[PDB]
């Protein structure tokens, strides 16, 4: 494949301010887009960590949606709408 590199910058600044609108935010400081990216990565890390850990214990090589859900449950962010 192609080398995967610096893809947290794919989380654009307009995409972040959109997420900020829907959260009820009117004025966004200039430093927010970096902090946002930092926190989202720590988040995604921790979930994909556990999701994959379920993939590994299953001896599976594809990460199933159920793996994501069991992961989100563990962290506490129980999700409705995928694989029951």
């Amino acid at each position: 494949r192609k080398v995967l590199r610096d893809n947290i910058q794919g989380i654009t600044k307009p995409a972040i301010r959109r997420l900020a609108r829907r959260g009820g935010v009117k004025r966004i400081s200039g430093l927010i887009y970096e902090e946002t990216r930092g926190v989202l990565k720590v988040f995604l890390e921790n979930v994909i960590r556990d999701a994959v850990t379920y993939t590994e214990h299953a001896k599976r090589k594809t990460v199933t949606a159920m793996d994501v859900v069991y992961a989100l449950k563990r962290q506490g962010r129980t999700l409705y709408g995928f694989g029951g």
């Binding site: 129980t78 999700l79 409705y80 709408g81 995928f82 029951g84």
Partner: protein, 93 residues
Amino acid sequence: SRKESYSIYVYKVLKQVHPDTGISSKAMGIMNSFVNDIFERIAGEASRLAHYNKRSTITSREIQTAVRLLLPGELAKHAVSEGTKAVTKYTSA
């Protein structure tokens, strides 16, 4: 394959409360997870109760105490009522 869900019984209850309203597939998924989430919270909480009280069997009494513990306020008593109702209706005949 053979993957069972509650889509049959959610849809029955949907036609009951809103006889003219349909439901999308995504929304049915949200429901099937909801039935499953509650089912686990209650059963787990009763599993814990029976284990706390040194009893190897889960009666409908344990489930009721679980329902009181998990469900908030009026949702609890409205639920407990509906449950007890279906139990007495069952045992009677």
